[PDB]
Design a protein around this ligand. Structure first.
Ligand SMILES: Cc1cc(CN)cc(C)c1-c1ncn(C)c1-c1ccnc2cc(F)ccc12
Length: 120
């Protein structure tokens, strides 16, 4: 277990760029980490966005969030640059603004301020 509940992380999921997240406990399984059906470690994350979402993300697709400027280092893992949809960039900028606010908080404070409420 490399990450704990309330840790800020970048997550790389599907067709989307490295996204600011916060590690959290899955509401059903009540764990923030598990070993998947392929034997790989996964972490449960909340995505910082105007559209709240959660996901189990493979450990190779999770990186410690040190600050928004770290983004370029993640892509680095004539020169080619991919464009981004205007709407996606707007939501990413919103997520980053939340992550930057969360970064100035203690783990205890950000868990209090950002952990999602789940309704059946
Ligand atoms: C799209 C999506 C949909 C669902 C189920 N409705 C679940 C998840 C986890 C995701 C998701 N997957 C990876 N990312 C980065 C997101 C995502 C999450 C929050 N806001 C976003 C805003 C965007 F502009 C683009 C993507 C996202």
């Amino acid at each position: 277990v490399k990450f704990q509940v309330g840790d800020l992380v970048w997550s790389k999921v599907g067709t989307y760029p490295w996204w600011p997240c916060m590690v959290s406990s899955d509401p059903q399984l009540e764990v923030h980490t598990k070993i998947n059906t392929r034997g790989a470690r996964e972490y449960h994350v909340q995505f910082f966005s105007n559209q709240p979402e959660r996901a189990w993300v493979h450990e190779k697709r999770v990186r410690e969030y040190k600050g928004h400027k770290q983004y370029e280092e993640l892509l680095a893992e004539q020169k080619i640059r991919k464009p981004r949809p205007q709407r996606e960039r707007a939501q990413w900028d919103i997520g980053i603004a939340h992550a930057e606010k969360a970064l100035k908080m203690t783990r205890e404070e950000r868990i209090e301020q950002y952990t999602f409420i789940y309704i059946d």
